[PDB]
Amino acid sequence: KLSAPLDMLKQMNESTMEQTKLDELRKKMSLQAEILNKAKADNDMFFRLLIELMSLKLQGELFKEQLSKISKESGYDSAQSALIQATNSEGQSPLQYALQKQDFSTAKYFLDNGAKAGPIEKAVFEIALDSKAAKEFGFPPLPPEKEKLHPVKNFGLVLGIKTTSVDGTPSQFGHIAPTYQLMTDSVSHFAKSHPGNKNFQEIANAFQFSNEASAFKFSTPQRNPEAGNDLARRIQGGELTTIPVSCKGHAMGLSYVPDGPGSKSGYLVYTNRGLGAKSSEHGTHIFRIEDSSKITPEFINNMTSGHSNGASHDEIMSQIKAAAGNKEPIHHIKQKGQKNDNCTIANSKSNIEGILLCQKAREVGGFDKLTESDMDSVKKEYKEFTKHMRVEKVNELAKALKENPQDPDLNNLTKEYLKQHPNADPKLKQTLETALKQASESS
Ligand SMILES: [Cl-]
């Protein structure tokens, strides 16, 4: 009917708290658990039995009784204390896990049992409500006002600034459309600033092509399956082609580097530094594609629509492996792990390192002919690009802070960048310190 989505929205609005209030509540329940002096809580176990319970697809009363049973089994006073304190290895609360899984019935049951809505849970919910599952549940479309990249997101996703806006919007988690637009803009800005860098001319052209073809609105592509056909035809034409790839609530990186114009061979470069990847495999993996024809338009359309179609991480990765002939990667670039973020910037950005490695391998005539100097030059070129992005964003943040010196979000963003990146380049530290002091001298 109409009752389930409306009740869900009302409950999630009523259960909304600031991060500090939820931390204080968790500390309170920790104090109560310590005063009781019983068995210590096991979060991993609790999440195991939570997934096992959700798989049973039980109704309200059965679900509530088993929820409290499994919460007592894992060393929690009640279901409520478990829902408020438990956290899996990825850092998700149970409500956050259920929302990212687009399991809206389970998330509603969690709110019935006292799960609360911090900024992260609200952000993950907002990402999940742009999905086919959110529409079948009865939710309305997201309001268009929310398509624009929030300033805290715009600066934190690029500069790695963990903070929350005064309106409660966290720096983490974002839709594919504005963040991929930002990535396209950044690669094209680096290309225009270094027009003699052929690698980045090619990379900027590929990014622009797939940004225009995918036609993302929020986190759903609006040209399927035409965008899949365009990208597949570009791949079989022998051109560099980026592939926007996602699963339920998570974004990765995917691209194809051809051996040359009109070639049929090349490389499939996949990147995941966050959810779904093991700690040892965090980063970029390069598959050798000796026939690009298994990269079909249907495959590309599935990749772009992974989140909105409700596809899981394993279905997406299986399709990627099958497109690579189910052979193992020939090379792995280790890149640092990211948690509690759908990696709309991290994965697509770090994918460029693999792109450059494949371009260098093509330059020297193959991966087996890559020398140490080649790979070290590749990594310093990638680090040059990332430093260009970082300097541009720091200057943009300083300029915006001066042109709006009383804004709480900009001031807090600058302070938090200074405070969480003390070993940054001292000229950017100076830029933002001078921005901060000029912003107070409008007393
Ligand atoms: Cl999965």
How far, in Å, from the CA of 275 to the mean position of ligand 1?
9
User: Residues 301, 224: contact at Cβ < 8 Å?
Assistant: yes
How far, in Å, from the CA of 18 to the mean position of ligand 1?
30
How far, in Å, from the CA of 172 to the mean position of ligand 1?
21
How far, in Å, from the CA of 110 to the mean position of ligand 1?
21
How far, in Å, from the CA of 395 to the mean position of ligand 1?
39
How far, in Å, from the CA of 87 to the mean position of ligand 1?
18
Question: Is the bond preceding 221 in cis, omega lying within 30 degrees of 0?
Answer: no
Of 90, 157, 83, 93, give the one whose Cα is nearest residue 121.
93
How far, in Å, from the CA of 248 to the mean position of ligand 1?
9
Determination method here? X-ray
User: Residues 382, 199: contact at Cβ < 8 Å?
Assistant: no
How far, in Å, from the CA of 317 to the mean position of ligand 1?
9
How far, in Å, from the CA of 35 to the mean position of ligand 1?
39
**Side-chain half-sphere exposure of 381, counting CA atoms within 13 A:** 21
How far, in Å, from the CA of 194 to the mean position of ligand 1?
40
How far, in Å, from the CA of 203 to the mean position of ligand 1?
30
How far, in Å, from the CA of 443 to the mean position of ligand 1?
53
How far, in Å, from the CA of 277 to the mean position of ligand 1?
10
d(CA 160, CA 421): 9
Tokens representing residue 241 in the block: 């082609």
First to last CA, the chain: 55
d(CA 154, CA 172): 10
How far, in Å, from the CA of 316 to the mean position of ligand 1?
8
Q: What angle do CA 54, 59, 60 make, to 5 degrees?
A: 105
Query: Could you say which DSSP state residue 250 is in?
Result: E
d(CA 94, CA 205): 41
How far, in Å, from the CA of 399 to the mean position of ligand 1?
42
d(CA 219, CA 273): 20
User: Residues 119, 164: contact at Cβ < 8 Å?
Assistant: yes
In whole angstroms, how far apart are CA 335 and each of 168, 178, 240, 247, 257? Answer: 30, 24, 22, 20, 20
How far, in Å, from the CA of 274 to the mean position of ligand 1?
13
How far, in Å, from the CA of 128 to the mean position of ligand 1?
16
How far, in Å, from the CA of 311 to the mean position of ligand 1?
8
How far, in Å, from the CA of 313 to the mean position of ligand 1?
4
How far, in Å, from the CA of 219 to the mean position of ligand 1?
19
How far, in Å, from the CA of 315 to the mean position of ligand 1?
7
d(CA 348, CA 211): 12
d(CA 314, CA 324): 15
| Ion ligand 1 — residues with CB < 5 Å | 312-314
How far, in Å, from the CA of 135 to the mean position of ligand 1?
21
d(CA 158, CA 387): 11
How far, in Å, from the CA of 20 to the mean position of ligand 1?
31
How far, in Å, from the CA of 307 to the mean position of ligand 1?
12
Q: Other CB atoms closer than 10 Å to residue 40's CB: what's the count?
A: 8
Enter the resolution in angstroms.
Answer: 2.5
Tokens representing residue 212 in the block: 């225009």
Phi, psi of 418 (to 5 degrees): -60, -35
CA-based R_g, the chain, Å: 23
How far, in Å, from the CA of 101 to the mean position of ligand 1?
9
Q: Is 402 helix (H, G, I), strand (E, B) or coil?
A: helix
User: Residues 58, 66: contact at Cβ < 8 Å?
Assistant: yes
